[PDB]
Each structure stands twice: as C-alpha cells, then as structure tokens.
Symmetry: C2
Subunit: 208 residues, 2 copies
C-alpha cells in the first residue's frame, strides 16, 4: 500500500524498472533515454503518489511519458529528486513561494494527497530550501507582500534584511521572513502582520 525510496546515483533505467515493480505498469523505453538519478522519499507514498514522483523524475531529466494502450512509452522531449513533507501549510500554497528558489534547470511539483512537494536540484540547494519550508510551515494562511526592486539586487537585499533581523537592528520586524526571487529581481515578504508590515518598510528604505 505505501512505499519509501532511497535510490542513489542509479541509472535512470533502474529507476524505471523499480517503478514498474512498485506500480505494475510496463514501459517501452526509447533507446535514447539515459542518465543518473538520485530519488529520495522518507515520507510514505501511495501507488498513485509513487507514479507522480516517477513523472517528476522523468520531467526533471527531459523525458515524457506517452499513453500507448496498456504500456506507456518513455521518450526524450548531478540532480537529486526529493519529496519534502509539509506538516501544517497546504502544499499548493507553498509552491508559488518556493518556486523562486528553484532554478530553471530544476523541478518543483505538488503532491496534494500527501501534502508534499517534489523538488529536483543539487543536494545542497535542496537542504537550503528545506530550511525555508520549515520556517514557512504553519497552520494559518500566508499573507505577503511583493517588492519589485528598481535599484538594489535581491540577493544582497535579502542578506541585509536577514542580517539586520538576526543582529537585532530591524526592530519591529522580528518574525518576518524574506524570499528572494532572483529571476525578476523581487522580494517576497511574509510573517505576522506587524512584523511583515515593518519588514516591507525596511525593504522599501533599502531600494532608494
């Protein structure tokens, strides 16, 4: 009924065979399919959720799965694919907030039935995104503010704002959180109302 997985530096063809053994689905794999994969889920996944993870891994490495009666065809169109369990926030709400941190070479997908996220990126950027998810995770909804920077640079702005909050220089902002969205040079500011409203003012003061 449920499965976990810990596959490290395995041929993508082994991962396909392991999905066939788990799900019972048989695949006809195009000769051009190739690559090394690392796939991890410490969370228990249902048969349907294992299939969603399979699609995310295929998409991560540039492969499409096409219906073909009974069997399905795998065809072309180091990264680890990890399943991250979210405890309190709805996963579909966190997706847009985490997408900025995922590079264009990566993958990000929701698994709403397990309240989990699937991410593909280098192992070190996943661990950094895991900490962001852990800080975001909460029962209440995330109201937020977006600031499109005109003069400053978001990775610098995010570091200054984080440093000021950690050192006690951002009085009133304690508890607020900032997510840098480097693709569009914008900041996403979260947190409880008073703290969030103050961090928006500090961020705005920085882009003058």
């Amino acid at each position: 009924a449920h499965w976990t997985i810990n596959l490290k530096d395995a041929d993508i063809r082994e991962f396909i065979d392991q999905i066939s053994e788990i799900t019972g689905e048989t695949f006809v794999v195009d000769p051009r399919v190739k690559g090394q994969v690392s796939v991890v889920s410490k969370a228990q996944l249902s048969l349907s959720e294992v299939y969603q993870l399979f699609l995310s891994v295929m998409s991560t490495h540039g492969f499409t799965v096409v219906a073909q009666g009974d069997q399905a065809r795998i065809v072309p169109n180091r990264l680890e694919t990890r399943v991250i369990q979210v405890q309190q926030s709805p996963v579909s709400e966190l997706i847009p907030l985490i997408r900025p941190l995922v590079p264009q070479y990566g993958h990000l997908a929701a698994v709403p039935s397990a309240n989990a996220l699937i991410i593909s990126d280098r192992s070190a950027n996943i661990a950094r995104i895991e900490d962001v998810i852990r800080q975001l995770d909460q029962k209440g909804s995330h109201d937020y503010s977006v600031i499109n920077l005109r003069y400053g640079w978001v990775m610098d702005a995010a570091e200054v704002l984080n440093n000021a909050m950690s050192r006690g220089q951002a009085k009133g902002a304690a508890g607020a959180q900032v997510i840098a969205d480097a693709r569009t040079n914008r900041l996403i500011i979260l947190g409880p109302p008073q703290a969030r409203a103050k961090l928006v003012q500090l961020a705005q003061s920085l882009d003058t």
Copy 2:
C-alpha cells in the same frame, strides 16, 4: 498563414490544429510527425510581429493549450498527446510600458484552468489562451495595468469573508471617497483561493491593506 511583417504576424481562425502545425513547419523548416490522436480546432492571432524564435514559442503555447507536446521518437520530432470549451483562441498581447513579467501575477487570477498564460520577454508580449470574448476582457485589464507606474502588491487570504463582497466594498469605498488614505490603490479579486491582491503606491496600498483586514473580522 504567417504573413511577413524576418518577422511575421498571424490571424488563423477555426483552423485544424494540423494546418497550424504545417504552417509552423513552412516558416521554421522544422519537420514534425503528428501522432494519429492529435486533433482539434485552433484560432491563433498575433498582430505584433514575431521573430522566428518567437513564432516557435507561440507554437509551443498552442500545443500546450490543447494538451500536446513535442518529443524525439524514431530519429524525428513527434507531436503527441500529453498526460475545456470547444473554441479556444491563443492570442499574443504586446505590452507597451511595463515589463511583461510584472503583469503576469496580476492577470493570472483571470486565466481559467483550461487556459494558458506564457511570457515572450524578447517581444515584451504575453501569450494567452481562452474564449475570444474572455481574451478581449483581459486585454483591457492589461491596458489599464500597463499605465500604472508600480506593480508591487500585497496579498490577503480572506478567512471569513467572501472574496467578491470584499472587493465590491473596497471598490465602492474608494469610488465614493470613504477609504481615506487608500485613494490611488486598486483591488484584484482572486476567487480560486479566496484572496485579494492589492496594488497602488506604497502608502495608499498600505492603507487599503489595513481597510481590507477590517472586512475579514
């Protein structure tokens, strides 16, 4: 057909998707094998002139709109079904003053789940897929949003209130002069998630955010 404008324009209405694929092959020189299951009627429109690479982006948006994708199968490119109303138009909307990426989160609440929305940053254009009457309505929203100097925004997830009521009260109060301090700010309802998107200059936006919180008490 694609009409020279090397740039082109296009205004294809109610054509077989297979005709649209053949036209893309004639312009791009790319040869495709179309899986027997690929079917449908398409309307594709660009009054803006598109380069060769932008015509290819429009092609991908049309394929994705109708549930198709391009794969490599047996030494050739194959268009296949990937894992909605009968009449969908795919229109390119050029944006004049604002960077297109900044308008995308403000117009996404208006694109339904069957639709499509993609950026074409090299032409500063948006590709939208929807019913022709719905696209015209979104084109007016883009024209109004594009005249604004800032596209910074605040999001409020309403826990108690109904989204459409809150938006109407806030708009009425701003139009009647009752939202002191928030004049100049604007509201976009996002029903799918029962949330408000508040825009405007910083202080007015900060005041409309406070006013919006009083309606969800």
